């Protein structure tokens, strides 16, 4: 509901999976919808952007059954040519990824589609995909190179070899999809190799791929898929179990990034008790994460990790609040407004929960202490709202978190997952 109310936890326990992120979730259902056969998708993020993708595919005749509370989809593929013109404009909500992937998928279809979304989405730039898509023969009308986009399906799409002056996995993913419906082969080359989840998903669905090249005329084969859990969503539970006495949990199949330091490792530096096991590379790289309660010490976050901490794992600041000593985030230069606002909200909430915290022009400083019960404002930022729900696990009293509407729309299963592991949170009427 509008506000979240928590009460202190007796200690977390149990095993859960957290959903994957938006990007992999979109790609999985999209590829499954045009495959032949039935695909069961586990770990599908059930937020508004991902369900907007689902409803769009259904408008075009896809068979997708949604089990929201279990993060499951069961897709009966309609084949490469089973999509049909939607009767109305496809509303992509706030999803830039949805509109861009759908533009690639629909450019080579033998029908027309209008793609739009909310006012935020109607300002998102689209030239980067429109031009390359036009080279393959796409007919995409738009004003100001932003949505709405009217795609006049071109069944005569032809493959292209594309040489980019800068890396971009968003363009690549779009062209790979358009390539599935284009004559000959479509190839994408970059100065440096960019992120490649689309490529692995294509292989998972048994499409042939040969820089990165794909050919039209091939066929997608249904194949069950378990989306790796988003480390950002998992971080909430990792911190919860780390700071709450008597806690022991296991997070199954969480996507792990081996090339970066990360939240698990920053937590380990604070003295956390985390075991990463059962590492596999057949999904993105995946692992089970076992977390037990552990006393923590404040650390100096290296500059390179400051933006990432604030952007992706602000719940790490909740762990700093209960550690012994101070934790310091100082970036080389003053932070961007998005970062500055985020830290100001975290600092203000922490202060309201009796923690000594100061915002800096290039970061923040947290004096480790004791979280008290009280009231904070999430400022409709789901990451902030969730971080304070986690602070509630150890707070001396109940914590009320105002304006949590965006948690339901970004990560709706948070509340049920929190409760299932012993972390008390319930939606209540606000203001
Ligand atoms: Cl969810």
Tokens representing residue 303 in the block? 């500059």
Cα dihedral sign, 373-376-380-381: negative
Q: List the chain domain ranges.
A: 1-21+228-431, 22-227
Is 226 annotated to bind ligand? Answer: no
How far away, in angstroms, is 9 Cα from ligand 1 center? 22
Give exposure, 209-241, as e/b (b: 16+ Cβ within 10 Å).
Answer: beebbbbbebebebbebbbbbbbbbbbbbbbbb
Is 383 annotated to bind ligand? Answer: yes
How distant, in Å, are the alpha carbons of 100, 344, 373, 429 from that of 33? 17, 43, 47, 38
Q: Do 41 and 32 form a contact (C-beta atoms < 8 A)?
A: yes
How far away, in angstroms, is 351 Cα from ligand 1 center? 30
How far away, in angstroms, is 277 Cα from ligand 1 center? 24
DSSP assignment of 53-116, as one string? HHHHHHHTT-EEEEEGGGTEEEEE---TT-----SS-EE-TT-HHHHHHHHHHHHTSSSEEEEE
Q: How far apart are CA 208 and CA 198, in angstroms?
A: 13
Is 108 annotated to bind ligand? Answer: no
Q: Give the H/E segment covering residue 151.
A: strand 149-152
Q: How far apart are CA 165 and CA 132, in angstroms?
A: 13
User: Catalytic: which of 118, 196, 273, 311?
Assistant: 311
Q: How far apart are CA 235 and CA 372, in angstroms?
A: 22
Q: How far apart are CA 410 and CA 382, in angstroms?
A: 7
How far away, in angstroms, is 185 Cα from ligand 1 center? 37
Is 342 annotated to bind ligand? Answer: yes
- 1-21+228-431 CATH, one of 3.65.10.10, 1.10.10.60, 3.90.1150.10, 3.40.50.300: 3.65.10.10
How far away, in angstroms, is 184 Cα from ligand 1 center? 39
Establish whether 311 is a catalytic residue: yes
Instruction: Tell me the technique behind this structure.
Output: X-ray
Kindly report the CA angle at 63 between 61 and 64, in degrees rounded to 5?
125
Beta pairing partners, 289: 251, 276
Is 96 annotated to bind ligand? Answer: yes
Tell me the CB-side half-sphere exposure of residue 172, using CA atoms within 13 A: 23
How far away, in angstroms, is 236 Cα from ligand 1 center? 14
Q: Do 386 and 418 form a contact (C-beta atoms < 8 A)?
A: no
Q: How far apart are CA 352 and CA 377, in angstroms?
A: 10
Tokens representing residue 269 in the block? 């530096």
Establish whether domains 1-21+228-431 and 22-227 are of one fold: yes
Q: How far apart are CA 386 and CA 315, in angstroms?
A: 8
Report the top-level CATH class of 22-227. Answer: alpha beta
Number of other CB atoms surrounding residue 399 within 10 Å: 28
Is 59 annotated to bind ligand? Answer: no
Residue whose tokens read 């400022």: 379
Pick the closest to residue 376 from 295, 423, 312, 318 (CA basis). Answer: 318
Contact residues for 281 (Cβ-Cβ < 8 A; gap 6+)? none
**Cis peptide bond prior to 148, omega within 30° of 0:** yes
Q: How far apart are CA 229 and CA 232, in angstroms?
A: 9
Q: How far apart are CA 78 and CA 46, in angstroms?
A: 22
Q: Do 17 and 229 form a contact (C-beta atoms < 8 A)?
A: yes
Distance of CA 386 to the CA centre of its chain: 14
């Amino acid at each position: 509901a509008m506000d979240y109310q928590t009460i202190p936890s007796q200690g977390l326990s149990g095993e859960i999976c957290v959903p994957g992120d938006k990007s992999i979730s979109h790609r999985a259902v999209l590829l499954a919808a045009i495959a032949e056969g039935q695909t069961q998708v586990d770990g599908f993020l059930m937020g508004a952007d991902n369900l907007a993708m689902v409803s769009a595919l259904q408008q075009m005749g896809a068979s997708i059954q949604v089990i929201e509370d279990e993060n499951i989809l069961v897709v009966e593929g309609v084949g490469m040519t089973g999509l049909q013109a939607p009767p109305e404009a496809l509303d992509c909500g706030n999803s830039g990824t949805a509109i861009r992937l759908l533009s690639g998928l629909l450019a080579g279809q033998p029908f027309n589609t209008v793609l739009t979304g909310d006012s935020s989405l109607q300002r998102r730039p689209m030239k980067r995909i429109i031009d390359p898509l036009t080279l393959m023969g796409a007919k995409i009308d738009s004003t100001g190179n932003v949505p709405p986009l009217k795609i006049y399906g071109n069944p005569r799409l032809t493959g292209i070899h594309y040489q980019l002056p800068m890396a971009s996995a968003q363009v690549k993913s779009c062209l790979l999809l358009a390539g599935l419906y284009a004559r000959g082969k479509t190839c994408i080359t970059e100065p440096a190799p960019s992120r490649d989840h689309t490529e692995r998903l294509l292989k998972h669905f048994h499409y042939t791929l040969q820089s990165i090249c794909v050919s039209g005329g091939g066929k997608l084969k249904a194949n069950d898929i378990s989306i790796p859990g988003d480390i950002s969503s998992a971080a909430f539970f990792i911190v919860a179990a780390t700071i709450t006495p008597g806690s022991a949990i296991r997070l199954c199949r969480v996507g792990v990034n081996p090339t970066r330091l990360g939240v698990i490792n920053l937590l380990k530096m604070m003295g956390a008790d985390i075991e990463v096991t059962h590492y596999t590379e057949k999904n993105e790289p995946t692992a089970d994460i076992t977390v037990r309660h552990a006393r923590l010490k404040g650390i100096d976050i290296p500059p390179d990790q400051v933006p990432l901490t604030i952007d992706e794992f602000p719940v790490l600041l909740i762990a700093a609040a209960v550690a012994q000593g101070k934790t310091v985030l100082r970036d080389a230069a003053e932070l961007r407004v998005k970062e500055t606002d985020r830290i100001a909200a975290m600092v203000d909430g922490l202060q309201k929960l009796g923690i000594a915290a100061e915002s800096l022009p290039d970061g923040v400083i947290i004096q480790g202490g004791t979280l008290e019960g009280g009231e904070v404002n999430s400022y409709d930022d789901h990451r902030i709202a969730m971080a304070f729900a986690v602070a509630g696990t150890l707070a001396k009293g109940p914590v009320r978190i105002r304006n949590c509407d965006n948690v339901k729309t970004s990560f709706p299963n948070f509340v049920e997952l929190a409760n299932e592991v012993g972390m008390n949170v319930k939606g209540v009427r606000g203001r």
